[PDB]
Ligand binder design. Structure first.
Ligand SMILES: *[C@@H]1O[C@H](CO)[C@@H](O[C@@H]2O[C@H](CO)[C@@H](O[C@H]3O[C@H](CO)[C@@H](O)[C@H](O[C@H]4O[C@H](CO)[C@@H](O)[C@H](O)[C@@H]4O)[C@@H]3O)[C@H](O)[C@H]2NC(C)=O)[C@H](O)[C@H]1NC(C)=O
Ligand SMILES: *[C@@H]1O[C@H](CO)[C@@H](O[C@@H]2O[C@H](CO)[C@@H](O[C@H]3O[C@H](CO)[C@@H](O)[C@H](O[C@H]4O[C@H](CO)[C@@H](O)[C@H](O)[C@@H]4O)[C@@H]3O)[C@H](O)[C@H]2NC(C)=O)[C@H](O)[C@H]1NC(C)=O
Ligand SMILES: *[C@@H]1O[C@H](CO)[C@@H](O)[C@H](O)[C@H]1NC(C)=O
Ligand SMILES: *[C@@H]1O[C@H](CO)[C@@H](O)[C@H](O)[C@H]1NC(C)=O
Ligand SMILES: *[C@@H]1O[C@H](CO)[C@@H](O)[C@H](O)[C@H]1NC(C)=O
Ligand SMILES: *[C@@H]1O[C@H](CO)[C@@H](O)[C@H](O)[C@H]1NC(C)=O
Ligand SMILES: *[C@@H]1O[C@H](CO)[C@@H](O)[C@H](O)[C@H]1NC(C)=O
Ligand SMILES: *[C@@H]1O[C@H](CO)[C@@H](O)[C@H](O)[C@H]1NC(C)=O
Ligand SMILES: [Ca+2]
Ligand SMILES: [Ca+2]
Ligand SMILES: [Ca+2]
Ligand SMILES: [Ca+2]
Ligand SMILES: [Ca+2]
Ligand SMILES: [Ca+2]
Ligand SMILES: [Ca+2]
Ligand SMILES: [Ca+2]
Ligand SMILES: [Ca+2]
Lengths: 387, 387, 387, 387
């Protein structure tokens, strides 16, 4: 067992090849499948796993009632092999949590699970399944984290947490964690910025995070930092707006785009110099469809021109949260860090006439060989027997 | 593989961080989940497992009928990974038993399973799944044991068993077991004492047990002993009474507190010099709620003042049995033995209008970082389809 | 990995301690549990497994209809950890078979599965899951084997097969198998004898088999042989008749006891010098109850006196097939071969008003410490929803 | 771990011994079993696995509706241990695919999964679960592959793919793959030939494929090639026609037999010099029954005489696709490559009045010891509760 280096560059990619699909909701119609949301993928030097937040209930059972609710003492972080349905019979317990993150440093798994009351939530950190540290809410207003994988470089793993209003200025902190122990943290000095549900990845020994501004931006904010937590902040400049909801594409801004800026969805983007791979919904108003767009100067340029678009989910099909995950050379045998992403396909409330809300997942990995756009939707027929 | 040393002290702790929650009853509404009671946790140098006594039946099935009954030829000891639901598809068979204990000596698992008739029950000892010894009832009146983990020190494991009345003077024996073989035992000379369902843990090469007086004590009896079984006995002196039922907190006694002393519930406490961490229900009369209380002189002092209280389960929510379990430095990498505990959340009879009785579980581990009180209840909606 | 020696003696035992109980039928009421019969246990140097013949159907499903039938192209030999319910989710596939045997030589598993038509059945031998040999019916009349574990000594495993009438003189052969290859066989010269469903075990480098005479004996026939297949034959002389049905106990015979000799049930017995441990039903007419009897001169003596009786299943409770299995010193660390046994508890047809027939199991191991008699019945409530 | 040599000859065999049967459809009546088609078996140096294409739905659930359809974004390649039912609880996710192949090179698994639109499908190659390459449709007309195992020789694995019409001249390419990377390919110059769903196996360092002519041949086309992809092509000459549908047996041809040549079914054959082992349906017009036929000069001779016939599935029972798979000496310890085969037993549409279509499987391995013909059918009772 050797810790991940994290010192190579991101693999440049021309397209995205489909990696997994679990068909969770379709199967859950009869099978014993957890009601879940906020799934995310993370890899070790040996395997890739799907993490998810359960509602402590199964699909098509009465206890799935009212699962549109985000937080409760019943939610737990669990994981299963990628591509498999999240079931009590194949899932590993990770932590009690209504907000979470996880990642592998090359030696062991780190998991971060937040639970407790809105006014004093506590993040429990585990390393190899053993509690190693905790961190308590410092603003007493819903301590919350990535809902995707943390990023690891040379034995240290990094994450971002938010505490405060989701409709105004909040507080954002970056953490450096070693063997499950917080060794350093810093509060981001970011007035007029808003950070939630960051998707973070390593690249050339440094961390880049693309996040969600729930306050007043329809473009996505970002934060990057080295291992010493020396950071920079900004917003993606592209007129190809990445959040949902958002305005129709037009001239962008290197600051928060106020038009349709309230609300949002977890997302991600991959930075390559001044360019950016943007993953976003197809609809500007609802969580429908998904597409990958290559914009060669979109990180710093404000125009709405782009070079490549690849369809992932049709515009008439349900999508939801999305996030980045990487495969390290230690796993692939490549000489660079390979970018991948996952998409949550949300079914149920509030858009459909059910008593429940749950999601299935698809994932893709970046390649330089031939690829194709299509639609890989959830495919479940609602409502269910329970409703 | 190396045997656990068990020679370090208990880690001092300031609070308790949530470690697991299985949501068993909620999931069992649809899923294939055992009807269980008396769950308990025990760890090896590699992993932690939940042990439990099944009724040889699944939730929401007709065979769950009359499972309020404690003893039958159908009950078996089984185990599964911590935090997972006890299902026939993920559970390991341990022993046929209606009373049980288990612990890992660093090399292999020891399980103790008692079955047979009330007037001649036999405890079957297994080491690495192989029968290694038996011990038969010596008072012919329901031979019974911990219903939680035994305690191991330097290759020897220790447990306590009781035989005789549950409403009067009985007989209590301590056992030393090596590789599943009883190498020594001694009967405790404890007139006017009553010991049942002991929660035992190792601390500085010696064993401490906190138990249940079902005869005439609303405070908890304790027994401690070295590897040679040289023992001491007493009662927790704190006016913060630990049993259920019990009187309102007042001046305590270093002997059995007779007020509300009959009946009781399995519980635990952690000794730290003259101080004590007490886990107990919130209700004085019923198995509802749960809390952890730090009383700096409560082991030997009779006053009812305490320093710390942490909420675990709300007073309006069902609780039940609770017990200690520890994580050895061989597992954690710490330089002390870490205290943890589990709580059984009992649903169904006799308090609820169902045909069945079963429990789910939560567990916590002691830390010195920030923690928070809350309520992590079972959360199931009764009655069920079967009733 | 080292092959089992099989050169030590059987462990003398004073009683039987309960080892496992699966509660298969109770759980199968709701859970996904195979309809099975002819379960048997067999051990490796590492673990013990339950083998069984499925009907290719689950309990409480329509395909369990008519499962009173013994042979079909749908029956398969499968195995699961001892004490666990036989489910498609925890069971390993072994072979297609309506008659079977299996055993571990210390290195790998040998399985023998017979399938095909009544007039030309073929036994398929597998070693480590790879087909290594076959043997075809030589009398064209239902080739059939032990339905319990084969016996292994120093890298060779031994079994017995029958071909011919089940109500008259048939043909019986002993086989020596090495790494799944038949290296020697011999036909037993046994006129007026009848051998079916032999329970065989190793003892001091030789094999002893106690079997079922379905033709004209209410006592059990036996055959013993060395590694070169030099054999001896006889019948258990004890007036404590072991088969079912049978007459009331009286003066026995060293030949087949004709009274109530037709029909029968698979069983076993352990030989100790002139003495014998006899396992049998409690009823003389039906497959009900079970008991272990120590008869110090019952192997060669014809009286009906005995020294020890231990209750296993109550007379009013269903029992069925039973068989021996052993635990080698390589597994236990003992200096002798430990005798164990299993009992099949048959529910359904023809005794009960269902459409199906299936069994659960219990098992016990021989010890010299204290034990107790009791009743550990199936405990399922019939009929089921499917009927 | 060492790569498979693949340099020995095929083991000559006189008959076929039954190896596995999963009873999938029977069990799926109640159990949680995938709706599947196109199952196939492939082995490593350690184990044999069943691969299959799911419809992302379970039997007896509403989502099984319209599963007669071959292609969709919901279909995935998964695998489970041979002989076990394909369940979400025991199946490993491999790839998103509506056409697939897989094989083990001695070190890791190679999987090939094709998904995407009919006019631009993309094959995703994975080595040890990691995407290693892609290949895109070159004729824009349903890129498709074996639906059985690829063949490996000395670290290189080989497969065949087709692009173009299924009712006329198409394009056929052979691929050489090393560690999941395409290192060479060549288009077959085969005017008037049609290749689909090839069954390929290694033999003396070279690859032989027997395939399906869906255009105008009732006999099967073949292609063989060395590691450098230098190939030869032809048709099986035997008047014992191997496809379905087909004419009654008569004089054959070394070219495509036009009579009943349109349409077909995936199948296989084993070449032995001028002789051939032919597996085929019993019905000439429908997918019913299955038999193995040894024709000593059937590879190059056009007569309709044969030497051996062995019944596998009765003519009145449903069959379906069939394919070859081999066990290498690295797995068996033999000095030759052992031939095995599997048969898909298709139930439901279009031949039966259900809303769904699915298959179970049986498999056999070649031996030189005694064997027997019989019928090992699916055995499910249709329709189901869902219909
Ligand atoms: C998921 O949650 C949904 C929201 O709760 C459930 O729907 C609700 O179902 C309840 C129970 O039937 C229903 O309850 C009330 O309102 C009734 C009129 O609409 C009223 O008649 C009920 O009260 C009367 O009866 C009760 C019981 O006897 C008495 O205690 C009262 O005093 C009175 O006599 C009761 O107030 C809701 O109307 C309904 N809500 C909605 C929005 O439909 C789903 O049932 C649940 N699904 C599952 C599968 O569990
Ligand atoms: C387990 O197997 C049991 C034995 O088969 C089943 O019980 C049987 O159920 C069948 C179907 O209902 C039933 O069938 C026949 O007999 C009827 C009179 O008893 C007769 O009316 C039926 O025939 C008529 O209808 C059919 C269909 O429309 C026509 O084809 C006929 O021409 C005629 O009009 C039919 O002959 C058996 O009576 C019954 N047997 C017994 C012993 O009860 C169970 O149903 C089965 N259980 C499960 C769960 O599958
Ligand atoms: C990346 O890290 C590895 C492991 O420490 C190191 O050997 C290598 O030199 C680094 N790569 C570069 C380009 O510096
Ligand atoms: C405890 O045992 C350890 C491990 O063998 C030993 O090294 C150490 O000396 C002991 N500690 C104490 C306090 O005696
Ligand atoms: C539950 O079991 C008891 C005891 O046998 C029985 O009296 C009662 O009728 C059962 N209840 C139901 C609802 O079946
Ligand atoms: C039994 O077999 C073992 C292993 O071959 C051998 O070492 C030993 O001598 C044998 N025991 C006796 C009593 O001969
Ligand atoms: C096949 O390869 C093996 C294994 O490396 C080699 O030893 C042997 O020489 C080869 N056999 C033939 C027939 O060439
Ligand atoms: C099955 O699916 C088809 C296609 O959507 C639909 O037309 C049909 O109504 C469905 N059948 C049933 C019984 O639901
Ligand atoms: Ca079910
Ligand atoms: Ca926004
Ligand atoms: Ca641009
Ligand atoms: Ca009390
Ligand atoms: Ca005090
Ligand atoms: Ca008889
Ligand atoms: Ca006698
Ligand atoms: Ca054809
Ligand atoms: Ca010929």
């Amino acid at each position: 067992s050797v810790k991940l280096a994290g010192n190579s560059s991101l693999c440049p990619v021309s397209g995205w090849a489909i990696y997994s699909k679990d068909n969770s909701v379709r199967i859950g119609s009869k099978g014993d499948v957890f009601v879940i949301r906020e799934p995310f993928i993370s890899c070790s030097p040996l395997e890739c796993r799907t993490f998810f937040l359960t509602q402590g209930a199964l699909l098509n059972d009465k206890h799935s009632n009212g699962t549109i609710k985000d937080r409760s003492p019943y939610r737990t972080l669990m994981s299963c092999p990628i591509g498999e349905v999240p079931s009590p019979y194949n899932s590993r317990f990770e932590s009690v949590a209504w907000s979470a993150s996880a990642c592998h440093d090359g030696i062991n798994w780190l998991t971060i699970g937040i639970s407790g009351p809105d006014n004093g939530a506590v993040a429990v950190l585990k390393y190899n399944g053993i509690i190693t540290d905790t961190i308590k809410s410092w603003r007493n207003n819903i301590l919350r984290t990535q809902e995707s994988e943390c990023a690891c470089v040379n034995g240290s793993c990094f994450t971002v947490m938010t505490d405060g209003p989701s409709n105004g200025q909040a507080s954002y902190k970056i953490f450096r964690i070693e063997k499950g122990k917080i060794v350093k943290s810093v509060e981001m000095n970011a007035p007029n910025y808003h950070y939630e549900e960051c998707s973070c990845y390593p690249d050339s020994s440094e961390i880049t995070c693309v996040c969600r501004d729930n306050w007043h931006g329809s473009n996505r904010p970002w934060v990057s930092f080295n291992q010493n937590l020396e950071y920079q902040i900004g917003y993606i400049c592209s007129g190809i707006f990445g959040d949902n909801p958002r305005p129709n594409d037009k001239t962008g801004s290197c600051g928060p785009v106020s038009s349709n800026g309230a609300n949002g969805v977890k997302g991600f983007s991959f930075k390559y110099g001044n360019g950016v791979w943007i993953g976003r919904t197809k609809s500007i108003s609802s969580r429908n469809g998904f597409e990958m767009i290559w914009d060669p100067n979109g990180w710093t340029g404000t125009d709405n021109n782009f070079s490549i678009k690849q369809d992932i989910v049709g515009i008439n099909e349900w999508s939801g949260y999305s996030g980045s995950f990487v495969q390290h050379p230690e796993l692939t045998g490549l000489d660079c860090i390979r970018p991948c992403f996952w998409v949550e396909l949300i079914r149920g409330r509030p858009k459909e006439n059910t008593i429940w809300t749950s999601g299935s997942s698809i994932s893709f990995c970046g390649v330089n060989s031939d690829t194709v756009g299509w639609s890989w939707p959830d495919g479940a027929e609602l409502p269910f027997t329970i409703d």
